[PDB]
Design a protein around this ligand. Structure first.
Ligand SMILES: [K+]
Ligand SMILES: [K+]
Ligand SMILES: [K+]
Ligand SMILES: [K+]
Ligand SMILES: [K+]
Ligand SMILES: [K+]
Ligand SMILES: [K+]
Ligand SMILES: [K+]
Ligand SMILES: [K+]
Ligand SMILES: [K+]
Ligand SMILES: [K+]
Ligand SMILES: [K+]
Ligand SMILES: [K+]
Ligand SMILES: [K+]
Ligand SMILES: [K+]
Ligand SMILES: [K+]
Ligand SMILES: [K+]
Ligand SMILES: [K+]
Ligand SMILES: [K+]
Ligand SMILES: [K+]
Ligand SMILES: [K+]
Ligand SMILES: [K+]
Ligand SMILES: [K+]
Ligand SMILES: [K+]
Ligand SMILES: [K+]
Ligand SMILES: [K+]
Ligand SMILES: [K+]
Ligand SMILES: [K+]
Ligand SMILES: [K+]
Ligand SMILES: [K+]
Ligand SMILES: [Mg+2]
Ligand SMILES: [Mg+2]
Ligand SMILES: [Mg+2]
Ligand SMILES: [Mg+2]
Ligand SMILES: [Mg+2]
Ligand SMILES: [Mg+2]
Ligand SMILES: [Mg+2]
Ligand SMILES: [Mg+2]
Ligand SMILES: [Mg+2]
Ligand SMILES: [Mg+2]
Ligand SMILES: [Mg+2]
Ligand SMILES: [Mg+2]
Ligand SMILES: [Mg+2]
Ligand SMILES: [Mg+2]
Ligand SMILES: [Mg+2]
Ligand SMILES: [Mg+2]
Ligand SMILES: [Mg+2]
Ligand SMILES: [Mg+2]
Ligand SMILES: [Mg+2]
Ligand SMILES: [Mg+2]
Ligand SMILES: [Mg+2]
Ligand SMILES: [Mg+2]
Ligand SMILES: [Mg+2]
Ligand SMILES: [Mg+2]
Ligand SMILES: [Mg+2]
Ligand SMILES: [Mg+2]
Ligand SMILES: [Mg+2]
Ligand SMILES: [Mg+2]
Ligand SMILES: [Mg+2]
Ligand SMILES: [Mg+2]
Ligand SMILES: [Mg+2]
Ligand SMILES: [Mg+2]
Ligand SMILES: [Mg+2]
Ligand SMILES: [Mg+2]
Ligand SMILES: [Mg+2]
Ligand SMILES: [Mg+2]
Ligand SMILES: [Mg+2]
Ligand SMILES: [Mg+2]
Ligand SMILES: [Mg+2]
Ligand SMILES: [Mg+2]
Ligand SMILES: [Mg+2]
Ligand SMILES: [Mg+2]
Ligand SMILES: [Mg+2]
Ligand SMILES: [Mg+2]
Ligand SMILES: [Mg+2]
Ligand SMILES: [Mg+2]
Ligand SMILES: [Mg+2]
Ligand SMILES: [Mg+2]
Ligand SMILES: [Mg+2]
Ligand SMILES: [Mg+2]
Lengths: 205, 118, 146, 64
RNA sequence: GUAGCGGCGAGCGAAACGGGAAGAGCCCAAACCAACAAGCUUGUUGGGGUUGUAGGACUCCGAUAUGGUAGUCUGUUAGUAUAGUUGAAGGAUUUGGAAAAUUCCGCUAAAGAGGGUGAAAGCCCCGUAGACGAAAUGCUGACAACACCUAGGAGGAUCCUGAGUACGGCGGAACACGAGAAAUUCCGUCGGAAUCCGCGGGGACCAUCCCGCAAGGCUAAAUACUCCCUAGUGACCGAUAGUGAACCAGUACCGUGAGGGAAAGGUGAAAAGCACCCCGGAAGGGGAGUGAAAUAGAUCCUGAAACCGUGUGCCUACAACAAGUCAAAGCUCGUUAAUGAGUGAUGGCGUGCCUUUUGUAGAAUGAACCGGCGAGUUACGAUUGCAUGCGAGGUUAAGUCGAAGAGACGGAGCCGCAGCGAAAGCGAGUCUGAAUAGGGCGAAUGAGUAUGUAGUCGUAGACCCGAAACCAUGUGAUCUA
RNA sequence: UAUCCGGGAGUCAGACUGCGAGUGAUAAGAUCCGUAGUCGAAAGGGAAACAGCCCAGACCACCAGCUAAGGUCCCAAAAUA
RNA sequence: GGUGUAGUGGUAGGAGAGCGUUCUAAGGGCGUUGAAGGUCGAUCGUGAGGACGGCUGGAGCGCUUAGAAGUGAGAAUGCCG
RNA sequence: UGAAAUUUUAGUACCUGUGAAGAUGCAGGUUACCCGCGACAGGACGGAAAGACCCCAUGGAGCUUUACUGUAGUUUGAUAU
């Protein structure tokens, strides 16, 4: 499609065209949902464990003889029903990460980007340059572009000053054009991307 | 993700105990005995919501029988006569007339006797 | 999509059924295992194919045959698949592999005459069924035994 | 771990094109004097695993 | 989970090729030469040589370089570890005991990670982003120095190239391989070679061919593990949990001993921990004070239930009661305002809950009561349903880059698209058969695959608790013989 | 409704009643079958009480009506018909 | 959404749909003008259960959607108090 | 001064009958004012001990032998020293 191009100062330049294969498809809602769930799961660390009766300290001998005492028969003071005994089942260290078909991954990414463009939440700036990193200047840039909600700032590689000036703002999340994820795009309410970053994105996809 | 007991247990058991308010001693104080009793209360309540209709029809019939006898008629003869006379007043209303409106009850009885004669 | 409005595809995800969590669920107490017996025990059940001591089916039946050490299996290709090429094309094991038609050639490509060939082709393969060779030649092509 | 194949069954049956199992016949080892020639002739022919037996053993042949 | 092994049972179960991580090759023995000592060889030292398209010695030549290291408490230098320095920006108003909370204006951000501060702080504090810092001692990396390896060609007349060794018999064992047709490897015992025209292997064995050169040694990286140290993380626990141990825990306690093995966290923002007075011997109370709060008073946050007690609205001393339910007068009271609430004379009906059973009120089992804890889980596979992506195709695994992420590359490999046969093999057919016959299995008559999810199953303790027992280390003759 | 194909089971201790047999003694609330019902897994009404007998299958509310088995002098509804 | 017809006892067990608990993400909120928790009430839903007030309490907690489970106790001569 | 076993909640009668066939609790009838104290032991199939008798489990253990299969020791031969 075509998206309005803005200069860093805020004034609008002429529109630019985005590859329809990437920004023009019909978004696939269920595929997007799958990608979000999968990525959130992959974020899990899953370091959690409990001590079963074999792992709990002690508990070797039989507490008392099988018959005669009038008490319930017991095999160890660490049996699960015992206070301080082992845990039946419970968490064990494991990984929650799985992978989708490459085609599904690609479709999900295209869907989120196309969804942003269709909603007109994609703001393309000709470039973002700062002589020195200054959060005040970048905040002013967002004001000029009239962005006040959650924004994903996608910068071409090497734009260190732009990235630095933007990162500390609470509503801003900074990513490089090479490293962009479905979760990042979906989390952001708007996507602010430079023209070089958009070109790199189209190259990547 | 450990889920400790929490307060759902207390909430559920307190509901049962409130249902058991008024029972005798432990049957209102202790949850196990209370729950056992509340269950029997449910069983008896469901059974009695059916026995209740039986009892009141029985009471109306007895009162109607007494009134019919005072009017010179047995309950069976009275109801047979009323059916012949096409009167559909049910036993609840008939008992009410017998106790309160003896004059109206006598009129009904006379119609029943007339129908039986015919 | 929005992180606060996610919705899985209908029928894509189901709720795990948990047994032994009260009677009204239908799997309380016995947890669907029934009443007593071997199958009602933790770790209960007999090994697959067991028949409580009656001679199992495999014991009844005789062993048969052997595996040839020099067995040779060929990746099979049919005339219908060959129709995917244009007239005069030189069909080769490399060509098929690149086309993805034959990902694994096993002992070599053997061409069979299942379908109807319609293009003149110079097919090179490990082996040809006699019918397949006739079809290729009759369609104006040629066959070479690689 | 990987589920194992029942080696005895693997030696005794063959997977057919339709997914069924081809099996030999019993009573084809010795004592042929006790069986009519018709019995021997008709036991020479292979057969298929019955539905009940197949449902019992299929998991032992999953990856045959 | 294939080839195989297996009372051919239960089960056990490869390897090579292919794709990757990492990569590195080197020394002797022998022949031969020199020296030395003994007693012509025979030992010490030195040189010489290190192999399979055979190499080496030895003889000729020509070279006295060229490259290298897996060496050094050898220095120089840089970095780094072990302390640290610096590090932006807020005041008011409302409530409050107290402001970080509310409201109005601001300011900072390479710092909006986090913690603390009288409640919830970007701007109060410690910090963070960022910048900078080492006398001393380690460590790493370079540079140097030293040290140590490093020769090409041509000839074979002769010489060398690992002996009680290889190998064999017998008996065991390891190879996935249980003696089996059994290679290959190893141990014990006995016998016992060849040596380049030589020797070993290619799963009995022979021949041919191919590949290699045992009976000598060393060798970094990729790999396994974490008692410890530093910095962090968690859809991990939150005081019956989590280590047995948040607390003076392997303590108290138990045992002769090995050994077994606990309980036990929370005043308040701040002790401001109740001066003084009164009852009492004290304890403990009542005032009076501190405090926002003392029914926060140290047995101290909250303060449930069992259990105990005080006060009383209703009922009860002619009644046979699984204790309730239905009906109900009277009395008392006034709600989430509802055709209300408490109690209840009297009347009807009515043998608990659970387990296990053909059948239990059962005189069959379990529960003294209350509270807490306490049982189908996860991993890897199999299979079916549902869902999504792609579709005669589907798909990557390890691994590399990356935030412990997504993602990208990685097509080796796996499933599917062709079956039939024990197999050679043939192939929309194939097998059986003499058969162009019949019949079996297939094709005509096509959907698969990756992933998610759920059901079930297999290997694992596999839903939880429970034996008498078995085996292997140890501690016990302070009782007793 | 039946087939067929597939996922998931549980069941393999039964009881009594009527009818047809065996065993028993033409005994057993006995035992073993066949057959139908009920219980099992079914509350409600009747049979005093009484799983298996007779009537009859509770989704609920009603202080409405009609009936089944069984009953109508009192307990106790209905005929001292 | 309406009408009509039919149906709605149930153990083993199969299927379906829900309640509630803790935590994660996002969104939107509530809290010294009193959260959670405790207690009381004559409240609401077909059920698990959900609110709303009074008192107590003194600092964290709901709600919507989705996700993950140490997710529900009344019984084990269960363990601890 | 101060326990214990036991304990589903109990406002805890008799007879006959019924019933899983031996009832304080069910049916019919009979008896019985409320609460105790000192005594007795008929019942609560009373408490205590998951019966040792009996049967079962493809349970355990100790023991025996001309059970099976092994084996320490003893002995005989070959072979090496
Ligand atoms: K089941
Ligand atoms: K066979
Ligand atoms: K045979
Ligand atoms: K395998
Ligand atoms: K076996
Ligand atoms: K040398
Ligand atoms: K802070
Ligand atoms: K240093
Ligand atoms: K061997
Ligand atoms: K070889
Ligand atoms: K070789
Ligand atoms: K307090
Ligand atoms: K009272
Ligand atoms: K009553
Ligand atoms: K008993
Ligand atoms: K599936
Ligand atoms: K034929
Ligand atoms: K045929
Ligand atoms: K599909
Ligand atoms: K387990
Ligand atoms: K399981
Ligand atoms: K002694
Ligand atoms: K079925
Ligand atoms: K019968
Ligand atoms: K409240
Ligand atoms: K659990
Ligand atoms: K208990
Ligand atoms: K009984
Ligand atoms: K007694
Ligand atoms: K013994
Ligand atoms: Mg242990
Ligand atoms: Mg006891
Ligand atoms: Mg524990
Ligand atoms: Mg609990
Ligand atoms: Mg009625
Ligand atoms: Mg799940
Ligand atoms: Mg069920
Ligand atoms: Mg239960
Ligand atoms: Mg059971
Ligand atoms: Mg049974
Ligand atoms: Mg069973
Ligand atoms: Mg047998
Ligand atoms: Mg034969
Ligand atoms: Mg015969
Ligand atoms: Mg060679
Ligand atoms: Mg500062
Ligand atoms: Mg402020
Ligand atoms: Mg072996
Ligand atoms: Mg050999
Ligand atoms: Mg030997
Ligand atoms: Mg060979
Ligand atoms: Mg190494
Ligand atoms: Mg606590
Ligand atoms: Mg602890
Ligand atoms: Mg402990
Ligand atoms: Mg208080
Ligand atoms: Mg307190
Ligand atoms: Mg009297
Ligand atoms: Mg009185
Ligand atoms: Mg019995
Ligand atoms: Mg008991
Ligand atoms: Mg308890
Ligand atoms: Mg000793
Ligand atoms: Mg001594
Ligand atoms: Mg009988
Ligand atoms: Mg049963
Ligand atoms: Mg009945
Ligand atoms: Mg019953
Ligand atoms: Mg009538
Ligand atoms: Mg009457
Ligand atoms: Mg008469
Ligand atoms: Mg019904
Ligand atoms: Mg909470
Ligand atoms: Mg639990
Ligand atoms: Mg009887
Ligand atoms: Mg009796
Ligand atoms: Mg009673
Ligand atoms: Mg009793
Ligand atoms: Mg006793
Ligand atoms: Mg017993």
């Amino acid at each position: 499609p075509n998206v309005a191009l803005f200069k860093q100062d805020g004034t609008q330049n002429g529109e630019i065209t985005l590859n329809e294969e990437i920004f023009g498809i019909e978004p696939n809602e269920s595929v997007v949902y799958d990608a979000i769930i999968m990525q959130r799961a992959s974020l899990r660390q899953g370091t959690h464990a409990v001590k079963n009766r074999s792992a709990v300290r002690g508990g070797g001998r039989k507490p008392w003889r099988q018959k005669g005492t009038g008490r319930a028969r017991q095999g160890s003071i660490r049996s699960p029903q015992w206070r301080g005994g082992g845990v039946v089942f419970g968490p064990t260290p494991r990984s929650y990460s799985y992978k989708f078909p490459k085609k599904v991954r690609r479709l999900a990414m295209k869907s989120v980007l196309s969804d942003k463009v269709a909603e007109n939440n994609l703001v393309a700036v000709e470039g973002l340059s700062f002589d020195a990193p200054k959060t005040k200047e970048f905040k002013q840039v967002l004001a000029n572009l009239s962005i006040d909600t959650k924004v994903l700032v996608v910068l071409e590689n090497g734009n260190d000053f732009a990235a630095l000036s933007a990162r500390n703002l609470p509503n801003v999340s900074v990513v490089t054009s090479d490293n962009v994820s479905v979760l990042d795009v979906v989390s952001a309410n708007k996507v602010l991307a430079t023209q070089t970053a958009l070109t790199q994105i189209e190259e990547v996809l | 993700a450990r889920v400790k007991g929490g307060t759902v247990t207390r909430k559920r058991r307190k509901k049962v105990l409130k249902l058991a308010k008024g029972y005798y001693g432990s049957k209102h104080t202790l949850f196990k005995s209370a729950k056992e009793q509340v269950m029997n209360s449910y069983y008896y309540a469901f059974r009695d919501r059916r026995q209740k209709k039986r009892d009141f029809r029985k009471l109306w019939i007895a009162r109607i029988n007494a009134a019919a006898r005072m009017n010179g008629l047995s309950y069976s003869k009275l109801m047979h006569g009323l059916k012949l006379a096409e009167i559909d007043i049910n036993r609840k209303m008939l008992a009410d007339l017998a106790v309160n409106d003896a004059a109206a009850f006598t009129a009904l009885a006379e119609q029943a006797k007339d129908a039986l004669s015919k | 999509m929005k992180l606060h409005e996610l919705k899985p595809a209908e029928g894509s995800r189901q709720v795990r059924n948990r047994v032994g969590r009260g009677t009204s669920s239908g799997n309380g107490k016995t947890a669907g295992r029934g009443q007593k017996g071997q199958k009602a025990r933790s770790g209960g059940g007999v090994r697959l194919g067991f028949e409580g001591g009656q001679t199992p089916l495999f014991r009844r039946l005789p062993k048969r045959g052997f595996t040839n050490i020099n067995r040779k299996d060929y990746a099979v290709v049919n005339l219908d698949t060959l129709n995917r090429f244009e007239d005069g094309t030189e069909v080769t094991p490399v060509v098929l592999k690149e086309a993805g038609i034959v990902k694994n050639e096993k002992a070599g490509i053997k061409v069979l005459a299942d379908g109807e060939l319609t293009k003149k082709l110079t097919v090179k393969a490990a082996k040809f069924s006699k019918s397949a060779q006739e079809a290729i030649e009759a369609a104006g092509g040629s066959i070479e035994v690689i | 771990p990987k589920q194992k194949t029942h080696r005895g069954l693997a030696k005794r049956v063959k997977r057919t094109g339709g997914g069924g199992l081809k099996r030999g016949r019993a009573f084809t080892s010795h004592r042929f004097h006790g069986k009519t020639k018709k019995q021997r002739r008709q036991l020479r022919k292979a057969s298929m695993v019955a539905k009940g037996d197949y449902k019992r053993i299929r998991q032992q042949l999953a990856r045959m």
